[PDB]
Amino acid sequence: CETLILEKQGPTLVITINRPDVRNAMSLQMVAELSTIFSEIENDISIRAAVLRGAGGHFCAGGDIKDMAGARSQKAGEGRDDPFYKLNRAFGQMIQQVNESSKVVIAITEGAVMGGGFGLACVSDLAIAGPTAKFGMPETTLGVIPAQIAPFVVERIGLTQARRLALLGLRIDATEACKLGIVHQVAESEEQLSDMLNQALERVRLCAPDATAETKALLHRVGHEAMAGLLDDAAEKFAAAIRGPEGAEGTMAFMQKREPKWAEL
Amino acid sequence: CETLILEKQGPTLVITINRPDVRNAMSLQMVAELSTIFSEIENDISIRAAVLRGAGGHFCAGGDIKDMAGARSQKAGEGRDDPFYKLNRAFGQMIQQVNESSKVVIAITEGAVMGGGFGLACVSDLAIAGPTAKFGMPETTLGVIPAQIAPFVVERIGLTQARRLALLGLRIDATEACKLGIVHQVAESEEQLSDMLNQALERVRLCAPDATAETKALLHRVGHEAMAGLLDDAAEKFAAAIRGPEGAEGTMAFMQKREPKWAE
Amino acid sequence: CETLILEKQGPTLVITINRPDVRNAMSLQMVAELSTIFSEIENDISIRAAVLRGAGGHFCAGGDIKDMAGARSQKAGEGRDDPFYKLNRAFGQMIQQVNESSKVVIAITEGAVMGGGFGLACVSDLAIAGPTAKFGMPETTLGVIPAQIAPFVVERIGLTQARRLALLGLRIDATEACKLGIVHQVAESEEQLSDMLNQALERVRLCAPDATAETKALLHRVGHEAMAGLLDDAAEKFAAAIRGPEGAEGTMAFMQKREPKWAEL
Question: Residue B33 maps to which CATH number?
């Protein structure tokens, strides 16, 4: 990886965004590497959680002006052939992919949180903010549509709060972001961040990977199909988990007050 | 009823979940009794609210291990004839049915709130927690899918807050449950809990029964169909209500600065 | 306009509801004039924002009895032809229209906010409450279904908080209204109300009109079609904006550390 530092750490992969020189501005190249890492871990057993963090006290400054310059310089198509379409769309593919990943996705969100980075925060299972975290959508002030980001902001916090943020192009701080639900928690120091992150990784260790993945997929279906058919499907998944190896293991563990296999070390 | 105490009390049915010995663990039998009570009152016009409360300071400890034992020992099945399927699915049927009941459903949640109990709280029109209420999804921790509960958590508080509770299997206190919208209010004493309950029941007395039920049914349709057609249907319901008994009665009551008949 | 005082200031149309005599009870005539104004400005490119305010310290005290009496007098009919149908439906028509307007809609809500007024507040891009603001749904208390208003309350604040307000016929104050998301901010006094308005109008000045409009329409689509197809269309809108007058102008503005033309004082 050119753009990211990877580190295994028990059942959890730490992904550090590694371009502190340009405040982690997000380039097409990064997008592709993120897409790749998430595709590779998707059907991997040892990885239960993925932590997203930026090197240098900044999560993401925005896009990379260079990819835009690059795309202007290419031949103009008009459709999905247009280099600006292709450039922009890949941000949404990757964000959506991360949203639907079978892994527990944790975003540690420091300093600037913009563009693609704001999107990633909007699709995490847990987001923790550092006290300098700033979240903004200045796009319309530049005559640009926040096309790939705003839709995840609507899912994240709802239409009512998203309207205000997106259409007035506001920049907000960690405390307001937490109140709105962009992030779940705010840490008042670099220390508290660590504790909060560790507590959450503790939680990941105790939770069963297959059950966690099946649950997560059920959650994304709520509200997009009738509840009754969803619950039918949910009950089949329950019956299947009970008769499969994880549920078997989990029963034994509660019998003897001991930790289950997936939770050891 | 064997798992529930039913007490009528004006236009309000008080349903007390009554297995204090096992801190109100929810059994298939309880599921069936709840489902039956709610079908029976669905049209009984003298009942306007149902209050759900657990005896002995706990709402629901979880599922009944004995129902699972029972299912294990039955003959295994393919898919929807699997006994685990039937057992689990019945919980979601009851919860969905409570959610769509034409009555105003108030939940009073104290102590442990888990499994079916958590689901019921997530499906109430008003939920009031006592200071000791704890809400947890420990399921994935035991290699179990919280299949019939988590979906109602998502409906109740949104995907963003539900993914965190469910996927980290957290257990939260009343204040956090209120802040997220699992419950609407938190009492700080048993007394404050009674008063809030009584204020809510007073509001139920003042509200017209057929209009409350029609309104409720429309609230559930929002976001599951095109808004323009919903408003069309809603305007027909408006017209019908105005023609009918309650509208007539309601306008007069306001004209004569007096309580309407359903408030009696 | 018979019920409304209209005032233009910059690209902001200030619409003042003007029946202080009856605390701004919303008549069928008011509904018709509101719908007319929003139809006309929909293309007028000199208007960027519409501000809704009430005269005399109240936003809307409810429906107009006169319209109801009028409707009882008319020939009864069935379904679409029922005069009660017609009377009711038009309120939702207008509210939906205002919800989807291309303009940034700001609601300034004081005193009573009920009926159509509550509905409007629930479809604003930004709502600011003054300290006297009171929001209620007394309809079922009168044997009436709040048919046109409640569906927007559900979109505004969610089913969970809306079931309580609506089905117990509650009336709440400004700070509870803010906590639930009916309004986005609350003022302590008159002059704070003015600052908040001016700050919002400043943000409107800085945001480019066409991009604001395209973004707003993408936002209303979220949750009502598959995400992937929506991001497809979003990227198309992004490309077209980049290659349009507004996008070219905006990059310029940022090249020469100068305001873009749409910001022009």
Answer: 3.90.226.10
